[PDB]
């Protein structure tokens, strides 16, 4: 029975699974919009350092934020291992997050760098589908899925109990994405991350179509198109598509982008280059991903509101200075485009200002007047409406847990579970933050069958009998696991107990022994025919398991018939023991 004690339902999902006396914290996350209240993870439910599996989901801090920062308090040298691609992107992302947020006199964050260095180089990498040797009776296998080019789900198998923790799985990939694989393992606990439940996902072609037409409309009015995104996230498809657009239209626009330590981004993207699709692998000789043109400018300080310019800010929702300080000039102009390639929670500043806050301050009583054409697309590449139902229909789950949803949209997410009630109706309980939801699991014990059980395969096939397949081979449980049919008598040191039930029936007849012998012989061929009985030369009969002889006669009017049957067919003899009791026939 697994516990699956969740820790969040809208953002910073840091749920943990407690099963088989093993507690595993998967993707320990932390909030990014707080002030000395939710900067780190909610570690108030545990005050120890006993974990079974510490696995993160993907690169950016929406699901893996505290596992790299709060490691100073709870430092473990065991299951803290992660996958392979999470070794070069994590250091640079935490570095830029520190120099962006922690460098502005934050409340509490990673001050020293030595602790970061050791908790990063202490991690052991995991290859593709590499089952890392856990402590005992546990295995962790990572499948493939294209979400951030390096994201993957992990399956923890602890004593016939497999739980799959998938981080933002999505379908319908593109050039900078891959296809999700499930391996068809048929698990029992499916903790999924549902973000777009009711909103149906449209095709990507019309998405790029509307993006290019709105970019053309913004460039026609000499508007500054400032697109905000993560440092190394879902912006690679954006820059590659705008590059293809620029080379197709042959324009001389600026098309600048933030540095964000670009001296190693292309190197890390082209070195491994394994967590991608085939469209880049077949043509690795043309440098389709890296080595691009018209996108080698830095929009950090050379971004002035003078003409039409395309800028790329390294911020999800204008965290500290990327899309807030360097993009504050192009916010009050009537001709200014601010494309958002992500959909965060309703707690940041830019997301709240775009949703319903047409006039709101930035930090403290700042300029609230902002009139533009800010419109966010669906380029977040998160769990779509079709992928979730395809997965729950192809996996056949027994319990669906919804994690990392929203505040109000989660109220509709459970409504989507109602649709599952028509296809995958099961114990689908959406646990809230810090609300554990246990589940009942089967036993799935372990036994050991000998070769005699193979004989049961002979009578099962090429036969019409039912309800009788393996009615033998009684259990022989001991310190070890072993069952047998006749070898139990050999291993316990004893022989077959000779049991022979014998009775002396009396018949009322004054005729000769041969006459009554032929009579009982002809009578045994009338009520039952599946039993074979032969006649002995002395004048007796014998069933294949029962023998009928004539004892010493006497009053000669009564004849004494000795019946004997072995215990193996004792009950059958009991049936025989019934027939002589329904009287003697009236035909002779």
């Amino acid at each position: 029975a697994g516990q699956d004690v969740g820790r969040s339902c809208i953002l910073v999902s840091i749920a943990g699974k407690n099963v088989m006396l093993d507690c595993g914290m998967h993707m320990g996350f932390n909030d990014d919009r707080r002030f000395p209240d939710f900067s780190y993870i909610t570690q108030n439910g545990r005050l120890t350092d006993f974990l079974d599996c510490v696995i993160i989901s993907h690169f950016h801090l929406d699901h893996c934020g505290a596992l790299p920062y709060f490691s100073e308090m709870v430092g473990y040298d065991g299951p803290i291992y992660m996958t392979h691609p999470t070794q070069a992107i994590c250091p640079i992302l935490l570095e830029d997050y520190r120099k962006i947020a922690v460098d502005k006199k934050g409340e509490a964050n990673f001050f020293t760098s030595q602790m970061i260095k050791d908790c990063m180089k202490k991690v052991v990498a995991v290859h593709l589908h590499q089952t890392v040797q856990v402590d005992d009776e546990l295995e962790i296998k990572a499948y493939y899925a294209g979400h951030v080019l390096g994201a993957a789900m992990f399956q923890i198998k602890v004593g016939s109990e497999s739980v799959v923790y998938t981080g933002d799985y999505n379908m319908t990939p593109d050039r900078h994405l891959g296809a999700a694989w499930i391996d068809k393992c048929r698990p029992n606990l499916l903790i999924t991350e549902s973000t777009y439940a009711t909103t149906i996902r449209d095709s990507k072609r019309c998405r790029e179509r509307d993006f290019l037409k709105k970019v053309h409309e913004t460039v026609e009015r000499g508007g500054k198109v400032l697109i905000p995104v993560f440092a190394l996230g879902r912006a690679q498809e954006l820059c590659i598509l705008l590059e293809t657009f620029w080379e197709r239209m042959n324009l001389k626009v600026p098309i600048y982008f933030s540095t964000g330590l670009t001296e190693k981004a292309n190197h890390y993207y082209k070195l491994f280059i394994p967590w991608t699709n085939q469209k880049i692998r077949k043509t690795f000789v043309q440098r389709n991903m890296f080595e691009f043109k018209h996108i080698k400018a830095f929009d950090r300080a050379f971004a002035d509101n003078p003409g039409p310019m395309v800028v790329f800010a390294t911020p999800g929702m204008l965290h500290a200075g990327q899309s807030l300080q360097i993009f504050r000039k192009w916010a009050g102009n009537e001709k200014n485009m601010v494309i958002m390639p992500g959909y965060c929670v309703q707690g940041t500043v830019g997301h709240k200002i775009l949703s319903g806050q047409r006039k709101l301050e930035m930090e403290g009583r700042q300029v609230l007047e902002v009139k533009m054409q800010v419109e966010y697309m669906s380029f977040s590449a998160h769990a779509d409406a079709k992928g979730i139902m395809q997965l729950v229909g192809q996996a056949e789950p027994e319990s669906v847990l919804l994690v990392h949803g929203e505040a109000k949209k989660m109220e509709f997410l459970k409504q989507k579970i109602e649709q599952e009630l028509r296809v995958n109706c099961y114990m689908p309980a959406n646990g809230e933050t810090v609300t554990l939801p246990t589940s009942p699991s089967i036993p799935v014990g372990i036994s050991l069958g000998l070769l005699k059980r193979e004989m049961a395969q002979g009578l099962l096939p090429e036969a019409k009998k039912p309800r009788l397949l393996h009615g033998t081979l009684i259990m022989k449980d001991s310190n070890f696991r072993l069952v047998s049919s006749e070898q139990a008598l050999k291993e316990l040191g004893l022989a077959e107990h000779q049991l022979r039930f014998t009775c002396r029936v009396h018949l009322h007849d004054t005729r000769k022994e041969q006459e009554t012998a032929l009579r009982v012989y002809s009578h045994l061929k009338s009520v039952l025919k599946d039993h074979c009985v032969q006649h002995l030369p002395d004048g007796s009969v014998t069933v294949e398991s029962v023998l009928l002889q004539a004892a010493a006669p006497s009053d000669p009017g009564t004849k004494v018939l000795l019946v004997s049957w072995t215990y193996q067919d004792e009950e059958l003899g009991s049936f025989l023991t019934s027939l002589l009791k329904k009287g003697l026939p009236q035909a002779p």
């Binding site: 072609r205 469209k279 389709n288």
Partner: protein, 409 residues
């Protein structure tokens, strides 16, 4: 006695009875009964006697054995069963309609090398006859699309599904179950596999998908106006295979179609690379299609002139495609005659070069479009008449005959 000995004996019996005799009177029926009565206990001869009874056709009337064996133990015997039943199919044998119900238990098998044949089974049982049952009309297509939607889970079971749907589309093809398939959100059909089966995995399934698409567009005259967009926007695939296949599927559907703004996404396949063997196919495609307005005609003309001035080694294909374009729709170039050739209303100067491979193309295009035009020479220049007189008498396979007042006959 042994496991392989029985299989070898059965193979010898099949080679000695199903290769030479192939007749009745204890030549194909006795061996089948002997193989059926020679059952085993655990994967001994089942996979062998299945194809034994498969290659021995008793008579045109033996399906109960495979029907009850379809639920055997080893899933690798179901493959032998399905290949044997396909061998019985390709010889007729009056396949019943009940197998389709059993085929349902073949849709959810949780195994490989079975669903790739299960889609073929549902296709053949739907293509046999859509009677004796809604009524097998656009019903098995939904199951085929549902099985093909999981293309990322198997690279072999998705191409076979599309290849089977290519011929399954020859059914009644109800619009209620066909128009909703071309969209993500379904409007009984509750699946996709049309807009989600292209950009999912390697192109070996994309080829089968576009093959099924052109196969269903050739038979049904409809459905083309809503799939031409999808057939055009799949050109930026950076694969040398999908491009020529797109040219082929567009050439095979070049009828009752329009082209207003989707030309730029299908013509740019000649500038990205050389494509020596694809250029002739693209030129044959561009000439058999129809253009809505004159802007597309002008774009195609300037692009062909660019290809000529950049690659003058294939001028014959350019002249032939321009001839076909002028013979298809000559009216669409009528408002463009004084714009192609440099003419002045009161100067009549700037005579172009005679042997210029850039002006002869426009000349032959105008001459080919001058067939059914009411007043073509009303906008001609002075040297155009002598150019036509010289080109017509020199070659006749590209310049047709006209009724100019200056010429005779």
């Amino acid at each position: 006695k042994s496991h392989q000995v029985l299989a070898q004996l059965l193979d010898t019996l099949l080679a000695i009875g199903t290769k030479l005799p192939e007749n009745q009177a204890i030549q194909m029926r006795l061996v089948d009964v002997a193989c059926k009565h020679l059952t085993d206990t655990s994967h001994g001869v089942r996979n062998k006697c299945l194809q034994l009874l498969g290659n021995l056709g008793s008579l045109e009337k033996v399906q109960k054995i495979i029907g009850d064996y379809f639920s055997d133990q080893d899933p690798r015997v179901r493959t032998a069963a399905i290949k044997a039943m396909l061998q019985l199919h390709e010889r007729g044998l009056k396949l019943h309609q009940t197998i389709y119900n059993q085929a349902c238990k073949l849709l959810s098998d949780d195994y490989e090398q079975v669903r790739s044949a299960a889609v073929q089974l549902i296709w053949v049982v739907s293509q046999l006859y859509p009677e004796s049952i809604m009524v097998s009309d656009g019903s098995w297509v939904v199951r085929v699309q549902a099985a093909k939607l999981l293309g990322s889970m198997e690279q072999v079971s998705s191409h076979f599904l599309e290849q089977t749907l290519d011929k399954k589309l020859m059914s009644d093809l109800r619009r209620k179950r066909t128009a909703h398939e071309r969209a993500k959100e379904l409007y009984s059909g509750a699946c996709g596999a049309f807009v989600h089966g292209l950009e999912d995995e390697m192109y070996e399934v994309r080829i089968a998908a576009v093959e099924a698409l052109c196969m269903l567009a050739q038979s049904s005259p409809s459905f083309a106006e809503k799939c031409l967009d999808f057939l055009v926007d799949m050109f930026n695939d950076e694969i040398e295979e999908v491009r020529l296949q797109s040219i082929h599927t567009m050439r095979k559907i070049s009828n009752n179609i329009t082209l207003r703004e989707d030309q730029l996404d299908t013509v740019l396949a000649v500038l990205e690379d050389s494509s020596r063997d694809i250029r002739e196919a693209l030129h044959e495609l561009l000439c058999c299609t129809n253009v809505s307005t004159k802007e597309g005609i002008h774009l195609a003309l300037v692009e062909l002139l660019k290809n000529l001035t950049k690659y003058p080694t294939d001028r014959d294909s350019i002249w032939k495609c321009l001839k076909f374009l002028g013979s298809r729709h000559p009216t669409l170039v009528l408002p463009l005659v004084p714009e192609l050739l440099s003419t002045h209303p009161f100067f009549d100067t700037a005579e172009p070069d005679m042997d210029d491979p850039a002006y002869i193309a426009v000349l032959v295009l105008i001459f080919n479009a001058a067939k059914t035009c009411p007043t073509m020479p009303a906008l001609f220049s002075d040297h155009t008449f002598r150019h036509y007189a010289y080109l017509r008498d020199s070659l006749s396979h590209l310049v047709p005959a006209l009724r100019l007042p200056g010429r005779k006959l």
